[PDB]
Amino acid sequence: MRTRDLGIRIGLGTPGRFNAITDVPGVRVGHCTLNEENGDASIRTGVTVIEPRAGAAHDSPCFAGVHVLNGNGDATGLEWIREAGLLTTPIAYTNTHSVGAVRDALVANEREAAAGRVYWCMPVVMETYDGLLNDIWGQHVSAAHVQRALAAAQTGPVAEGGVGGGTGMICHEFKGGIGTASRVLAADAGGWTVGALVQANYGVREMLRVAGYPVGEVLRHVPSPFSIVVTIATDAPLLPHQCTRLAQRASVGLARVGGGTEDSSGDIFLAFATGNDGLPAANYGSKGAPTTGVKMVNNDHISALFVAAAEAVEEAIVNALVAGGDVESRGARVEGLGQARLLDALREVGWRPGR
Amino acid sequence: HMRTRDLGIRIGLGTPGRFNAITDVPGVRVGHCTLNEENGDASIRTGVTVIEPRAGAAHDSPCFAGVHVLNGNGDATGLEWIREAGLLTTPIAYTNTHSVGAVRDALVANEREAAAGRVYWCMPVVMETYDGLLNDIWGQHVSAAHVQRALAAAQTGPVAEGGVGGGTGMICHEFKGGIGTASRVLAADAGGWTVGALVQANYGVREMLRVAGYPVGEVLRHVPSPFSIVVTIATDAPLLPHQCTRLAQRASVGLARVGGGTEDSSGDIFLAFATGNDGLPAANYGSKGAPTTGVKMVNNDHISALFVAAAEAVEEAIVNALVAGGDVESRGARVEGLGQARLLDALREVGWRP
Amino acid sequence: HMRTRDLGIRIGLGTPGRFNAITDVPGVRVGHCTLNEENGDASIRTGVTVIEPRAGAAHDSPCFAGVHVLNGNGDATGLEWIREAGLLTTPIAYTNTHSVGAVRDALVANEREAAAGRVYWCMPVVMETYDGLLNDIWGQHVSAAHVQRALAAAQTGPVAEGGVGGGTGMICHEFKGGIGTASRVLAADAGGWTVGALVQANYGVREMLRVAGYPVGEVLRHVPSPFSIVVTIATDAPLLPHQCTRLAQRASVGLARVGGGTEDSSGDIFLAFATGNDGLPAANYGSKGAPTTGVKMVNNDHISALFVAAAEAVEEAIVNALVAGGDVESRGARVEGLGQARLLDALREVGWRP
Amino acid sequence: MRTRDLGIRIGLGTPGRFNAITDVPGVRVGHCTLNEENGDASIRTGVTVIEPRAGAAHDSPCFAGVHVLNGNGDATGLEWIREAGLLTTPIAYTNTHSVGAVRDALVANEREAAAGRVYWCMPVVMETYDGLLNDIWGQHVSAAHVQRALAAAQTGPVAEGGVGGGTGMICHEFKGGIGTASRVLAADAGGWTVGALVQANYGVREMLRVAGYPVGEVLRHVPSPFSIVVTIATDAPLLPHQCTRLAQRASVGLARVGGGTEDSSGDIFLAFATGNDGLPAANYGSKGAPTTGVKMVNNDHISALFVAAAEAVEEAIVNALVAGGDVESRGARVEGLGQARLLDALREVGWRPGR
Ligand SMILES: [Ca+2]
Ligand SMILES: [Ca+2]
């Protein structure tokens, strides 16, 4: 079923229980998937939400940071993450032309709980472009779809491939979409968990590499129909500047699968940490204590977090491909990579299970 | 006398363009949609302002551009590609913090008919300030129709200031705030370029107000109080993406001179675009052109005059927003316009003379 | 001599610390080495200024730190790890542009004896401005011995200003420039923290000079002219690396108010460090400790008072440099000190009063 | 001799004549190698210089940009590169504690030619840490060594491994140091050349990857003694913001060999382009025309430059390892990877010659 279940092991680290971003305790994920056949008005899109906390994000801010490998994409809520490193909302993935509707729907969702608290809601919404398989000009994603994803957001196993925001996506000229993975550090390394959730929509066929092996080079013959957003989570107590460091390691994971070299690819990365809690919620005009006690991972412990994030992102992307299935829409056809076809290509270029 | 300069108050040392507005950069157009409706705590005092960077469709003639963030406690769309590639390919819009998404997706929808099978993803630039005091900002009352009204209203010439468009419900230095604009023209020996600024001023505490350097805020503390700033700089200088970033940061200088830039809570986000290069290729993925494009670059020994001009334009734009602001009562809060006669009196009191 | 505040000139609204200097941040030390030697075109008017962030060795008690660059037309060492990890682990030094390397490597050498098999690579912070008009800057006259002299002279208490240390041959607003310092203390209800600034001012055109907002430069154009600014901000507030970056950018605000920030040629580079967290681990690669360190963070509803204080401290520090500057004739160039009486006359002419 | 001569192909691209950064016309490289045994005062260090032009850099500035993957390192001259994107000097590599002496030596070198022109010289100097094999506290590099490297700077083949600045460096717990490589685009893509020169001093044994194959995993048994600076050059007419984009692709090449996950690693990248010439030399007080006509690579042509740079960086790193030999110094021993041992490790993980 998933990459690791095929005996394909990415990197050297050990996954958490679900091998998903939800292995970071409290983190929840929900999809809303739109699939409707209607000629050039066919809908192949949706929205994915990440809740950073067990409860409302506004009440328990997370330290966070962003890194942009290639900004050919759109996002909301990132400027305050750059400035103050505080994630105070859910995170959502959708298509390029639906970002605003999704963002303002997330704002409306906090209206009722705003008990006269003075603040301006700034949700984080990121995107990739499903213009080939989806009627992206049709702007078919609505607040109701955001509410369905929010209601479905839960811990445990996370559906992958052509679901939620990844529904109409294409990766390495195969079916793309949602992928997730995690790594758990050893006790002597802090015992922290690092998880990643990607929406993979990038890359040319020949460049595909799986566990390092040049599998793309022997997969050129397969028919082709012819951006990637990454969230990294960890329960390590990382400060804002450390979340920035962690986010950039998404470049490392993406590069190892064969990405990061396209002008057209919106490669935008976010990392948040749950280790520090009890951070002050924004409520302007209402002042608390001058300082807050927080914890910081010492820099001689942060490399094991970099390694883990890089692995989690790499496997998350390959998981997206493995979960991908055939899609025909609006006159375009994309094939799922195929579990057996991947195993065959791996063997052809010298990979073997348990070497 | 209506605007700052008309009162005999001169900001900086430079010479303004004909309208003393961002529209003094040829082809740049500005349009407002102003929303006013009384309904207790659901009162509407907000709207949208749009900037057209070109005489025609922004998509067909991209502008080099850059952003600078003095304090990112605010939201914006369309900025990541500006950072990456420095290309403005859409109109610019101002609105309130909770309407950014609706405005942005309305701007995406507006380009649908003209797309005609060209492959690209629309990424409009939308910025905001917070009108939560005078406006029902949780009400999300701005819609696509309001964006379409602002677009159709976009025009050259004089730009309405104060409580209009996106500035309708804004508050600055505890007076009425909102839209402000100004411009500077360089001498011919310096390239003859025009630099314009359009601000949505919603920042600042009373005591900090400075007009032409004079501490007028210190003698205006007695005036009743009801208790972010987005800046666009435009120029017809042929600035490259990295030069637009340099130009954008000079909004810090202008803002600082009026008494801003020291609030944690203030979304101070600046954008600068240049119209001097007008032969840039429109985005059309899958459709490949020639390897290179010849472009123009301002030499660095000519860019300082543009820095000065931008700083002065931003400074006067903010003071213009204040001078144009009028009294507003809404949702149980009252704010006073600074007042032309009152500003002159305060100026004289702290030693200023015409 | 008399400083700005002694002339009855008050910058901003805040209250200075005891020495009105960066040394008001407890433990911080400053030392100058001043080279002044008349020798025709080989005249030496330069030197080095050092800041010790701690009472003892910087390496043993790192400070959280951040940088902001308003205009990167200058050179600096040690900034990349400050950007990356926000850790100041060395003294800070100011000198001229062509002596940065010798000064940097001398600071490396200074830690050699204390290294005692500890595994790390020394990365001192060295910044500069250009004294090429009054100083034989191609002569590269600054050496390790001068760095040791500054180091040995580093102490708390009053800091000499003007044409001393790194500021010896510097020029500001076409008057004598150089070293300036100032501080602000927050009220107890605001955390009671101290914010200090030390600048080496070498920027600006005459007409642009503003003192306490008043446009004195405009009435000082007649004064003969001989024709970058590095800023360090310190605070005992417990600021995290990302917060030090925010604080550092407020040097843009202070600098703007005196009339800077609009020159392509000006290396305007700012560093801010905080001493509030003092239990940070010294770098020793290969020798690992506990997984985490508990630290303190200033809450964001308390950081605005720090922004204000930093901007005021930077502004007064620049004016302090000008006030302390005296006449210098060197290498065929003459620059005048602003002049205490001349400044007072100029201020009164444009409406200022004590 | 070199990686490609072993039948090992990195990426899909075609190298230039020298497979070196010198394949960008006019670019020159010179080494000064210090090797002296003297107990704990042994010298194993030096300096490498890059001339971006056939003549003096000051008189013909290059557009340039920087990217920092991990700023645990020191450099001079980068702030004006960030600000205005203008390279106006040679570039030098040395050890961490010699950066200042090398930089001021480069300033002094321009003195005679200054001839009353008003400017402040801001040379670009970068470093990695050779503290294990070299007496790095001894500060044994001087202006005379810089002058030797400058005089030795020439086009053509570039010596790799433990030479110049790479003399005492260590990579993946093998001998490290200088590596270089290049790629040439087809006439279809603009025909431009992309070159890279690295000083590789990073990485744990286990993570080493060659052409994707995880050879490090079967090389753990080899004895161990227990940063990377990259310059990318191209004759494409890249503007400063485009040079920044190109520089970040060093992250991709570095990631593919197994780097980018160490807190301790100063991973600092510079890219300059030679395509635009006649850029105005800095001479403050002496004013020219308001504008200059320059060229820009269109964004639908920049991806091939992205790919080329990532491939050149990757092969350059492996070239450094392949060129490395055994070194014993100051109580430490490091082994060269070994060409035959590498071919063996490659077969062990499924690699075979002849594609
Ligand atoms: Ca931080
Ligand atoms: Ca550029």
DSSP assignment of D257-278 = HT-S--TT-EEEEEEEE-SS--
Using alpha carbons, list the distances in angstroms from residue D154 to C197, D30, D270: 47, 6, 20
Helix (H) or strand (E) holding C178: strand C178-185
Measured N-to-C along each axis, helices A303-323 and A240-257 cross at an angle, to the nearest 10 degrees, of 50
Q: Which residues of B touch D298 (CB under 8 A)?
A: 281, 289-293
Tell if the CB–CB gap between D78 and C77 is shorter than 8 Å: no
Q: How far apart are CA C19 and CA C26, in angstroms?
A: 11
CB proximity list for B23: less than 8 A, separation 6 or greater:
B29, B30, B155, B156, B157, B158, B159, B181, B196
CA-nearest residue to B243 within chain C is C264
| Distances, alpha carbon C141 to alpha carbons B302, C50, C161, in Å | 33, 17, 21
**C-beta separation of B269 from B72 below 8 A:** yes
List the domain range (segments joined by +) for residue A32: 1-355
- How many other CB atoms are there within 10 angstroms of residue C80's CB atom? 23
b/e code C94-115 from CB counts within 10 Å (16+ = b): bbbbbbbbbbbbbbbbbbeeee
Mark yes or no for CB contact D104/C102 under 8 Å: yes
* Euclidean distance between CA atoms A139 and A46, whole angstroms: 10
Give the dihedral sign, CA D105/D106/D112/D117.
negative
CA distance B328 to B337: 8
Q: Report how far Cα C245 is from the mean position of its chain's Cα atoms.
A: 16
Q: Chain C 191-230, CB below 8 Å of chain A: which residues?
A: 191
- Secondary structure (H, E, C), chain A: CCCHHHCCCCCCCECCCCCCHHHCCCCEEEEEEEEECCHHHCEEEEEEEEECCCCCHHHCCEEEEEEEEEECCCEECHHHHHHHCEECCCEEEEEHHHHHHHHHHHHHHCCCCCCCCCCCCCCEEEEECCCCCCCHHHCCCCHHHHHHHHHHCECCCCCCECCHHHCCCEECCEECEEEEEEEECCHHHCCCEEEEEEEECCCCHHHCCECCECHHHHCCCCCCCCCEEEEEEECCCCCHHHHHHHHHHHHHHHHHHCCCCCCCCEEEEEEEECCCCCCCCCCCCCCCCCEEEEEEECHHHCHHHHHHHHHHHHHHHHHHHHHCCCEEECCEEECCCCHHHHHHHHHHCCCCCCC
Q: Among C347, C256, C254, C352, which Cα is nearest to C309's? A: C254
Give this entry's resolution in angstroms.
2.0
Report angle CA B262, B268, B270 to the nearest 5 degrees: 135
Please give the backbone phi and psi of residue A77, each rounded to the nearest 5 degrees, phi first: 75, 5
Alpha helices by DSSP H, listed for C28-166, are 79-85, 100-110, 112-115, 144-153
Q: β-pairing, D28-36 with A170-171?
A: unpaired
Closest CA to B166 of B343, B47, B23: B47
Q: CA dihedral defined by A247, A248, A254, A255, rounded to 10 degrees?
A: -170
Other Cβ atoms less than 10 A from the Cβ of B154: the count is 17
> If we measure between CA atoms, which residue out of B270, B284, B244, B269 comes closest to residue B89?
B284
Q: Phi and psi for C257 in degrees, rounded to 5? A: -70, -25
| Nearest-angstrom CA–CA distance, D309 and D303 | 10
Rounded distance between C-alpha atoms, residue B282 and residue B302, angstroms: 28
D342 token code pair: 């590498």
With the CA atoms of B196, B198, B203 and B206 taken in that order, what torsion angle do they form, in degrees rounded to the nearest 10? 70
Give bridge partners of residue D161 from the DSSP assignment: D178
**D245 at the B interface (CB within 8 A)?**
yes
**B353 touches C: beta carbon within 8 Å:** yes
Q: Identify the H or E element spanning B306.
A: helix B300-324
Give CA–CA dist A74/B83, Å, rounded. Answer: 11
Interface check A350 vs D, CB under 8 A: yes
Q: How far is B204 from chain C (nearest CA, A)?
A: 11
Distance (Å, rounded) from C-alpha A184 to C-alpha A308? 8
Buried b (16+ CB within 10 A) or exposed e, C174-196: bbbbbbbbbbbbbeeebbebbbb
Contacts with C104 from chain D: Cβ below 8 Å: 99-100, 103
Q: How far apart are CA D45 and CA D178, in angstroms?
A: 12
Short-list A137, A211, A199, A204, CA closest to A169: A199
Residues in CB range of A51: below 8 A, 6 or more apart: A27, A28, A29, A30, A57, A90, A150, A153
- The β-bridge relationship of strands D124-128 and C76-77 is unpaired
Q: In what order do the strands lie in the sheet with C44-52?
A: C29-37, C44-52, C92-96, C125-129, C76-77
With contact defined as beta carbons under 8 Å apart, do B194 and B183 qualify? yes
Residue with tokens 């370029």: B193
Q: Please tell me which of the candidates B218, B257, B264 has its beta carbon nearest to residue C257.
A: B257
Determine the Cα–Cα distance for residues C15 and C312; give it in Å rounded to an integer.
10
Give the residue on B whose Cα is nearest the Cα of A121: B98
DSSP-derived pairing of the beta strands A174-175 and A177-184: unpaired
Partners of D83 on chain C (C-beta within 8 Å) are 69, 71-73
Which is nearest to A195 in space by CA: A3, A348, A15? A15
How far, in Å, CA of D216 to CA of D207, rounded?
Answer: 5
Active-site residue among D60, D227, D251, D329?
Answer: D227
**Of the ligands numbered here, which is closest to the C-alpha atom of B85?**
2
Based on the residue annotation, tell me whether C228 is a catalytic residue of this protein.
Answer: yes
Resolved by: X-ray
Q: Take residue D35 and report the two structure tokens written for it.
A: 């090797």
- Measure the CA–CA gap between D2 and D315, rounded to whole angstroms: 10
Q: Could you give the C-alpha distances from A184 to A212, C249, D225, in angstroms and in order?
A: 21, 38, 29
**What residues of A act catalytically?**
227, 265, 267
Residues A248 and A208 sit within 8 Å (Cβ to Cβ): no
Beta bridge partners of C31: C50
D contacts of B289 (beta carbons < 8 Å): 298, 300
> Structural domain tally of chain D?
1
Report the alpha-carbon distance of residue B266 to residue C53 in Å, rounded.
30
Residues 51-80 of A with CB under 8 A from D: 69-70
Rounded to whole angstroms, the Cα distance separating A220 from A6 reads: 22
Distance from C-alpha of D336 to C-alpha of B119, rounded to nearest angstrom? 51
Q: Interface partners of A (3+ CB pairs, < 8 Å)?
A: B, C, D
DSSP string, C206-243: GGG--BTTB-GGGG-TTS-----EEEEEEE-S---HHH
- Which residues of chain A make contact with B74, given a CB cutoff of 8 A? 79-80, 120, 122
- Decide if C301 is catalytic: no
Single-letter code of the amino acid located at D42: S
Q: Residue D306: its chain B contacts at CB < 8 A?
A: none
SS3 B304: helix
Beta-strand relationship, A124-128 and A91-95: parallel
- Beta carbons of C261 and B253 less than 8 Å apart: yes
Which chain C residues are within 8 Å of B300, Cβ to Cβ?
A: 264
Helix (H) or strand (E) holding D251: helix D250-257
- First vs last C-alpha separation in chain B: 14
Would you call D303 an interface residue with chain A, using a CB distance cutoff of 8 Å?
A: yes
* Phi-psi category of residue C249: left, alpha or beta, with phi > 0 → left and psi -120 to 50 → alpha: alpha
Q: With an 8 Å Cβ cutoff, are A240 and C238 in contact? A: no
Please tell me the distance from the alpha carbon of residue B22 to that of residue B159, in angstroms, as a whole number: 8
* Secondary structure of residue D25 in the 3-state scheme: coil
Phi, psi torsion values for B269, nearest 5 degrees: -125, 125
Closest CA to C207 of C191, C223, C226: C223
| Token duo for residue D217 | 């995993």
* Euclidean distance between CA atoms C104 and C111, whole angstroms: 12
Helices (H), chain C: 79-85, 100-110, 112-115, 144-153, 241-258, 304-324, 340-349
Return d(Cα C352, Cα B213) in angstroms, integer: 11
Q: Which two tokens stand for residue A146?
A: 């955001």
Token pair belonging to D239: 């503007």
Size of chain C in residues: 354
D267 in catalytic set: yes
Question: Pick from C264, C303, C351: which is nearest to B350 by CB?
Answer: C351
SS3 B192: coil
Q: C272, D73, C64: which is closest to A241 by C-alpha?
A: C64
b vs e for B204-232, b when ≥16 Cβ sit within 10 Å of the residue's Cβ?
Answer: bbbebbbbbbbbbbbbbeeeeebebbbbb
- The DSSP code for B263 is -
- In this structure, the number of other CB atoms found within 10 A of the CB of residue A241 comes to 23
User: B175: which strand partners?
Assistant: B172
What does the DSSP 8-state code read for residue B214? B
Which helix or strand (DSSP H or E) is residue B245 part of? helix B241-258
Query: What length does chain D have?
Result: 355
Find the radius of gyration of the CA atoms of chain D.
19
Q: Are strands B87-88 and B63-72 parallel, antiparallel or unpaired?
A: antiparallel
| Rounded CA Rg of chain A | 19
Total residue count of chain A as it appears in this document: 355
What b/e sequence results for D77-109 when a residue is b if at least 16 CB atoms lie within 10 Å of its CB, and e otherwise? bbbbbbbbbbbbbbbbbbbbbbbbbbbbbbbbb
Task: Please name the residue of chain C whose CA is at the shortest distance from the CA of residue B71.
Answer: C246
∠ CA(B312), CA(B313), CA(B319), 5° rounding? 90
Contacts (Cβ under 8 Å, ≥6 apart) of D347? none
Residue numbers in A near C297 (CB within 8 A): 291-294
- Determine the distance separating the centroid of ligand 1 and the alpha carbon of C294, expressed in angstroms: 13
| DSSP E strands, D91-211 | 91-95, 124-128, 170-171, 174-175, 177-184, 193-200
User: Within a 13 Å sphere around the CA of C189, how many CA atoms are in the beta-carbon half?
Assistant: 1
Residue type at B287? Answer: S
Backbone angles phi, psi at C333, to 5 degrees: -120, 145
- Cβ pair A197, A158 in contact under 8 A: yes
A240 CA from centroid of ligand 1 (Å): 4
Q: Which two tokens stand for residue D127?
A: 């470093």
- Tell me whether strands C328-330 and C87-88 are parallel, antiparallel or unpaired: unpaired
Q: Which of the 8 DSSP states describes residue B191?
A: T
d(CA D296, CA A142): 40
Task: Find the residue in D nearest to A215 (Cα).
Answer: D212
Q: Are C33 and C165 in contact (CB under 8 A)?
A: yes
Contacting residues for A174 by C-beta, under 8 A, at least 6 apart: A205, A222, A321, A324, A334, A335, A336, A337
Q: Which ligand is nearest to the CA of B86?
A: 2
Give the CA dihedral D137, D143, D145, D146, nearest 10 degrees. 110
CA–CA distance, B196 with D159 (Å, rounded to integer): 54
Quickly count: other Cβ atoms within 10 Å of residue A35's Cβ: 17
Q: Strand D43-51 and strand D86-87: pairing? A: unpaired
Q: Going by C-beta distance under 8 Å and a sequence separation of 6 or more, which residues neighbour residue B70?
A: B249, B251, B252, B255, B261, B268, B269, B270, C249, C252
Residue C31 is encoded by which pair of tokens? 């030392």
The rounded distance, in Å, linking the Cα atoms of C95 and A182 is 50
C32 CA → ligand 1 middle, Å: 32
Q: What's the CATH code of the domain at A70? A: 3.60.70.12
Residues 6+ apart with CB under 8 A from C44: C35, C36, C37, C135, C136, C139, C141
The reply to whether C295 touches chain A by the CB within 8 Å rule is yes
Q: Do D100 and C101 touch (CB under 8 A)?
A: yes
Q: A217 in the Ramachandran plot: left (φ > 0), alpha (ψ -120 to 50) or beta?
A: alpha
Nearest-angstrom CA–CA distance, C221 and D129:
52
Token reading at D253: 């090449």
Report H helices in D64-174. Answer: 78-84, 99-109, 111-114, 143-152
Work out the angle at residue D95's Cα, subtended by the Cα atoms of residues D90 and D100, and round it to the nearest 5 degrees. 60
User: How many beta-carbon contacts under 8 Å exist across B and C?
Assistant: 86
Contact call for residues C70 and C268 (beta carbons, < 8 A): yes
CA distance D62 to D77: 14
Cα–Cα dist D269/D273, whole Å: 14
Torsion of CA D219, D221, D226, D231, to 10 degrees: -10
Tokens of A184: 């758990």
Residues of chain D numbered 91-130 and touching chain C (CB < 8 Å):
96-105, 107-108, 111, 114, 118, 120-122, 125, 129
Task: Return the HEC string of D296-332.
Answer: EECHHHCHHHHHHHHHHHHHHHHHHHHHCCCEEECCE
